[PDB]
Design a protein around this nucleic acid. Sequence first.
DNA 1: ACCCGGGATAA
DNA 2: CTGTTTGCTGGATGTTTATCCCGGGT
RNA 3: UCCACCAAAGUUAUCGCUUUGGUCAAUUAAUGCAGGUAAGCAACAUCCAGCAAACAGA
DNA 4: AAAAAAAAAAA
DNA 5: TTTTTTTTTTTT
Lengths: 726, 162
Amino acid sequence: PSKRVITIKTTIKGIWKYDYRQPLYDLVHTTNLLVTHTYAFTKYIFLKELATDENFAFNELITKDFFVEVFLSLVSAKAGNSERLKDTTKRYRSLIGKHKDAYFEDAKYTPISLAYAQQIALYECAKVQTAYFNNMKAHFGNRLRALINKLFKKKEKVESLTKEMEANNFSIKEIKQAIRKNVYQPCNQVKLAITKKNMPESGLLDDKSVTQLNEFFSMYAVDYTFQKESIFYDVVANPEKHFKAFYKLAQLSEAYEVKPFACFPLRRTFIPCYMTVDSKILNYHILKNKKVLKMDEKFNAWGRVVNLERKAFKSQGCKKTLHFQGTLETDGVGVSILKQNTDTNRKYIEKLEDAELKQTLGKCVLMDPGRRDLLYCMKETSRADKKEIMIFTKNDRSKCSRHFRRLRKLLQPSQIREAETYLSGFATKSVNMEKFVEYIQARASVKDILYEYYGNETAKSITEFYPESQFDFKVDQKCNLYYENLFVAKIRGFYPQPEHEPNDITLKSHMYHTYLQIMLNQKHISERLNSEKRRKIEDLAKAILEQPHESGHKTTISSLLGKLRLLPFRKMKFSTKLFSDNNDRKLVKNIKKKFGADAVLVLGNWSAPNTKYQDPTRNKGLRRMLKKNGFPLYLIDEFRTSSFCPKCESDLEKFKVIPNPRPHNQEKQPKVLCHGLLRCKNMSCLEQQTSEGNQRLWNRDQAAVLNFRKILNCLRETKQRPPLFS
Amino acid sequence: MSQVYFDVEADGQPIGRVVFKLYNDIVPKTAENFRALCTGEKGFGYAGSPFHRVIPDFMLQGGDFTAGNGTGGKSIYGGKFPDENFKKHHDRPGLLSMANAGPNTNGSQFFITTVPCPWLDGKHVVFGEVVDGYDIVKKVESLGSPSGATKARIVVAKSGEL
DNA sequence: ACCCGGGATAA
DNA sequence: CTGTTTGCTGGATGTTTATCCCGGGT
RNA sequence: UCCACCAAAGUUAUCGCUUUGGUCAAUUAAUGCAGGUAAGCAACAUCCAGCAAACAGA
DNA sequence: AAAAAAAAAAA
DNA sequence: TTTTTTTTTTTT
Ligand SMILES: [Mg+2]
Ligand SMILES: [Zn+2]
């Protein structure tokens, strides 16, 4: 039967028993480090073998069976029966050992004792293989086309021809035709020749390009022929026999100074990533059991670590057909619970029909998707005297993201900044041996500090990241208490105070003790400090009473509490996901409130491409979320929908000059033309006046939605798009 | 105008009683909330709530029955209720008013003024006056400090209405 | 003769 | 015009379970 | 290197414009929404390609 | 300038 | 059937 998987997110602090938390942290850290080293060592082996002999059989080694051996080579365990090893396993182990010692010295790494590491290796190597295959399938064709264009020197030839024809005073269309029939057509011929594996017609490429093409084609077998006479199709159809060639392609790109791309996937994030916790993994590593756990006890073991009666683990879906099957994905802070229904034992409005189009009368909502204003929505019944308008901007969605970004920017220790700047001198996506080895050494030089900083949530931390730092409590206008930037609690009886500015020494020296006492009782603060530090902190607080004027106690307490300034990055990501979900639900609720429960959504056809100097925009995900909530969503073209005046169909223009909207660019370009404000050239468009020259002013989104309404009405009345918007 | 009384104990030793008179006819809602908190009808009250801020010659404060450090306090109507009126002013000592973190942030915390506070007019609501036990109020105030920290733990052991 | 690990293969 | 760390958006592919045998204890 | 939401006005369906009146869960908290005893709803991890923020180097 | 979209011209 | 090409959105 059909299979579906539903994932539910939660936190370790909620479902995980305190008794078995540290083992989970240790397992997560070890697994993440081993996976990162597995990626690095796999790329190291591939580049070492391909950099010495090009006859190496690299295509057949991209499989989970080899990645598993690579992963296990990084773990120390008691040796088994070697004579029972599989034939391929022996070759994989020999190849790994050929470079194991060199890689350990390069990365300054030692094997980590981890018994029962087979399942973890399998789970991580499956993802490694998936990443390799997906990356190749995705980008092989595009990178091949880029290399083909570079080989023919398309840009250079185009520029040379254009600059030669300029001296002859040729016309624009003549230049375009000459470029088309002198550059583009031979380039397409070369494209076809390379696609069908046959060399192009003589003279289309120089000797160097011919040699490079010969080298590229030598990667494939002599008798091997691309299926359906298309390399771009054979890559998807039979990826297995292309990986080696892909590498060569990447090399050729670096031969032309093209921007490097990650041919070999690598894990570079220092924050621990999610790992799959299985029943066997839980039994062996977390429960520390030393005997086989069969399916009969499968759930009972889970009952000894987490509670299965909570909402998170309860059955879900229609008729409760989805059940938890003892598989989790956790990184020590966030937890993903998977539920499956089977055993684990191996349109456009212009193209709508009359019946569908005419049932939306009085329910259509016209949306103009912008960049800063994500959704400008207007209803059909909107009038000048009744504004049924809604605005959903980028600030509302980016509140939490910007807050977290500013927190990271301000709280980043200088040492981490220096480490990142130093590591910036070594590219990772390069396929050259020298650069990869240099990056390995550079990463080894700063891994300790980077992991300690980013693993502060669960890893042991001793480094002092904030030397010569003094912390003083502050209270904002809302009576919220902050240490430096860490929220403590809201004081509801703070305003009542004596006359303004009681600057006596005793008050300002003793309020610190009161604020410290208030802070220490907070759960989210106490849980972050162990008894060893808490006892000393309380002892110093006691001494502060005797001598408030002394500053040494404050410095000592600040040094002790410096741990609180580190950020929970994983929990920040979890909160970001929750904030995104909350924003989606808030938008749905606002749409259902302002417009109606059964409102029909009309959205612009803008693709919202990622453009330089602007933040990423959510367009496809927005439509998917809207449809998932039951809103009928239909696309309407935006052709000439913002360059005409709805009042009289006259053209619009930009006139207002405003300082640069972005403050940081004001010092460079002080003023720019307003983009969201337009005016109608037709003077008579505005109501009667004593020749004062006033002209109607429009917000571009409002004009766009009005033109959308015009188009919808024209389609309803005639079923054809209005001529002005053809 | 109903009256309410509290029993004050320092370090487990009773020290006196304070008798209050409420302006029910002037501020009905705040007076009703204070009476409910004093009588414990709503399942929660000032019983055991400490005086967490005593500033000598300035004020005594209390009413935090959820955290005991000024960060807690809830009213019968919910988290907070709007200010009712300002028909009374801080012109004489012994006045009992509500502490707040700004407009429309009234909760359960209350305070008693030992000296005139003309600068607090229009910022907080006055809804009671001390009718007896002002000597006990001064006795407790003598144990206060400028920062508000009390030299000993002072809590309300019993409360009642008359 | 009995029991206790722990790597490795495998659908 | 590039690089490191983080994040936002979009595309693509998965999400376990006995059984065998050598070495050790003894 | 910043900007949460709802309404009036300069004003004309007026701008990363401005003055006002109203809301504040602040948050380095936690599975979220909606319901009052339960009860219903909600796809997550990795990699890759673009873009954004801090710094560095042509 | 720079990314995708509907639809037309060219072979 | 496939590749450029015209016009427009968003904003710099
Ligand atoms: Mg538009
Ligand atoms: Zn007009």
